[PDB]
Structure formats: C-alpha cells, structure tokens
Write a protein that binds this ligand. Structure first.
Ligand SMILES: *[C@H]1O[C@H](COP(=O)(O)O)[C@@H](O)[C@H]1F
Ligand SMILES: NC(=O)c1cccnc1
Length: 252
C-alpha cells in the first residue's frame, strides 16, 4: 500500500533464512554450542512474536528462545559498551577472550536485524515495524534486547568493563540500554568493580573525561549499589588499536 502501519523500518529481508544461517555458523564455530538444534532455535524465535500484536510483546514470549540459547559466558570477561558499537566489536574480534553481548549466540543471531509480526495472522511484516519512541516500547526488537541484556548483565562477575564514547554529549547516558538495563542488573554479590574505558575522539587527547559530570553520575549510581567504580581515559584510540592488534609491539 501507499501507507505503512508503523514508523520504524520493517523486518529485514530473508529474516528467517538469516537467523537460521547465523545459528548454523555460530554453532559450528563455538564448540560448546554443538548440541544446539538450529531449527528449534528458529522455531522458538518465531513463536515469541509471530501472530502476536507487535506492541504487546513480553519477556515471557522470549523464554523458550532464552532457554535454547542458554550459554555459559566467562563471567569475568564481559565487555559492556554504550554508543560505541564499532570499536567495542573491533576490540573483541581481536581480543578473543572478551565478550560483548553480540558475541553470544542470541546477540549474534539478532545483531543489526529488525523483525515483527501481525496480530491475528501468521506473516512477518516486511513493510514496517513499531518504533520504540514513535509507536510503542513493547515491540519484538526492543523486548528481545531488554531481555537478553538483563541476562547478560546478570551473568557478569569480578571486573566488568564498559566502553564509552567520550566524543558524545552524554558520555554516560542513563537512557541507553547500558544505563537503563545493564547497570541495574549487575549482581553486587558477584561483581567487584565496573571499569569504564572512555574512548576519546580524534584530536582531543588531554581532558580527563573521568571527571565528566555524567561519569560522576555513573560512579555514584554504581557505588550506591555496593560495586566499586574505576575509570580510564583512552586518550588516543589509534595507539590503543595498534596495541590491541599487536600487544608484543614494544611501543605498547
Ligand atoms: C546491552 O546494552 C549495551 C549497548 O546498548 P546502548 O548502551 O548503546 O544503548 C551493551 O553493553 C549490551 F550489552
Ligand atoms: N537495546 C539495544 O538496542 C542494544 C543494542 C546493541 C546491544 N545491546 C542492546
């Protein structure tokens, strides 16, 4: 038609085939996931949102999928990130012992994808899907990420690291998924310290951004949860990348 139901982009093309293929690839590479039945995972993923009103999705809708995608992640090697997707993933593609959410099976399946269904019908909506702000918060994509992000934060222990973008207006943003979900789901019983890495923009290599007002807000929130807060400036991201990629580099 000339008119779309929703304001957000619609389901990604070939969504069913892509989720299936990503599940196949992941379960072949990661030996602990050998037992996973990819067709079952996809069936669980479909059942969460097909035939459901795309503004009435629940965390319970995703429970069969969460159960099939159960994964033990090394609890002390978690990298959270906020608003600095590319660098965080470049880092874990090189430093293979550390994991972002998108390096887990469920995160990897859904990364950069959009999906929604229609109430009272079995089809996937390839035309449009609800936008979190303009349409509704309880939509398939938003509910998925809230659910898996909580579970990922709950798995963390010891020192948890978070990469933040120092070139942004709000380096720490309380309204981000990091700030609204992950920070409040770290377990004080298990997590000793949250350590922030504030990644500077090009050019500005001097200001101590760990004294930034929003970092101080993060510190206060974390401290009041009985978790220690630590912060480091990455003043020059080029040198940081040089050193991550080649840690024998005697300049590092
Ligand atoms: C969960 O949320 C952050 C990325 O979301 P955002 O803060 O950029 O909104 C990651 O740490 C994921 F684990
Ligand atoms: N909630 C989200 O949009 C999101 C995006 C990327 C990683 N984790 C969470």
């Amino acid at each position: 038609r000339w008119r779309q139901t929703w304001s957000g982009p619609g389901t990604t093309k070939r969504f069913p085939e892509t989720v299936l293929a990503r599940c196949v690839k992941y379960t072949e590479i990661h030996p602990e996931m050998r037992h996973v039945d990819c067709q079952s995972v996809w069936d669980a993923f479909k059942g969460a949102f097909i035939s459901k009103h795309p503004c009435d999705i629940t965390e319970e809708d995703y429970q069969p999928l969460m159960k099939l995608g159960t994964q033990t992640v090394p609890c002390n090697k978690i990298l959270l990130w906020s608003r600095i997707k590319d660098l965080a993933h470049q880092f874990t593609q090189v430093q293979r012992d550390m994991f972002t959410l998108e390096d887990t099976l469920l995160g990897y399946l859904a990364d950069d994808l959009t999906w929604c269904g229609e109430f009272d019908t079995s089809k996937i909506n390839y035309q449009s899907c609800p936008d979190w702000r303009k349409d509704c918060s309880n939509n398939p994509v938003s509910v998925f990420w809230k659910t898996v992000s909580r579970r990922f934060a709950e798995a963390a222990c010891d020192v948890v690291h978070v990469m933040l973008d120092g070139s942004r207006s709000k380096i720490f943003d309380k309204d981000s998924t990091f700030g609204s979900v992950e920070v409040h789901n770290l377990q004080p019983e298990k997590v000793q310290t949250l350590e922030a890495w504030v990644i500077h923009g090009g050019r500005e290599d001097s200001r101590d951004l760990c004294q930034d007002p929003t970092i101080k807000e993060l510190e206060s929130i974390i401290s009041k949860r009985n978790i220690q807060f630590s912060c480091k400036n990455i003043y020059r991201p080029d040198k940081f990348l040089q050193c991550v990629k080649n840690p024998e580099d005697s300049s590092c």
